[PDB]
């Protein structure tokens, strides 16, 4: 009707990528506290009914690999899909431990023409990272 | 026929071009808010409502505090991008 059908054996898979330590080359510091979030996110999404698995300090290749494999899994009995990214980031890109990779490439795998089992089902991405360097001063 | 780009939703911790504030002690602001709003209404509010509350919660309650006068008292607002075509509820 007007809402997504949530009538499935499973709610969906929730992938949580938690990058805390980065390669010396990347020049990015350690994201302390990122574990405090991951645990909180893990508990939260588990409570909603997600079958959540967490991946730590992943190389760009790794992250690409995971999201690709997952898009190739069979989501026929899943109500939806959810992915969470906790890392360093910049405009349009996210950091792996070895470098950066385009967010659009990580999410493209789930396009309808590339992941039928999730066709017409919500695909959720939560990203906690930077998107630039500008700051917000506030007002009044 | 369905748009291959449809039914996607992105919940960014910050707007394009800005910084996301994480508290090495309590964790990032977006996640703190997202978790609290979830572990309290996740089962009874549509996805957009939840995210709006996270936006408000983040927009208000938080305000950075660092030495660098240029990184002192800064604010942050999350960004939600939606291609959903139905309402989303995590129940029933």
């Amino acid at each position: 009707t007007y809402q997504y059908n949530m009538n499935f054996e499973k709610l969906g898979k929730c992938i949580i990528i938690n990058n805390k330590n980065f390669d010396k080359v990347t020049g990015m510091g350690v994201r302390n506290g990122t574990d405090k979030d991951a645990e909180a996110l893990f508990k939260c999404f588990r409570s909603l009914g997600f079958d959540v698995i967490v991946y730590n300090d992943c190389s760009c290749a790794k992250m690409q690999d995971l999201l690709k494999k997952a898009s190739e899994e069979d989501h026929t009995n899943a109500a939806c899909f959810a992915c969470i990214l906790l890392s360093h980031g910049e405009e349009n890109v996210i950091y792996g431990k070895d470098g950066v990779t385009p967010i659009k490439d990580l999410t493209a795998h789930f396009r309808g023409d590339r992941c039928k089992t999730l066709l017409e089902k919500p695909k959720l991405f939560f990203i906690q990272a930077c998107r630039g360097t500008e700051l917000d001063d506030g007002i009044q | 026929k369905i748009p291959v780009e449809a039914d996607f939703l992105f919940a960014y911790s910050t707007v394009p071009g800005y910084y996301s504030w994480r508290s090495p002690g309590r964790g990032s602001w977006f996640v703190q808010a997202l978790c609290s709003i979830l572990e309290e209404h996740g089962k009874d509010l549509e996805i957009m409502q939840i995210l709006t509350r996270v936006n408000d919660r983040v927009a208000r309650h938080f305000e950075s505090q660092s030495d660098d006068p240029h990184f002192h008292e800064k604010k942050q607002i999350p960004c939600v991008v939606s291609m959903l075509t139905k309402e989303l509820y995590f129940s029933q």
Partner: peptide, 4 residues
């Protein structure tokens, strides 16, 4: 308070 740090930035990501």
């Amino acid at each position: 308070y740090v930035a990501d």
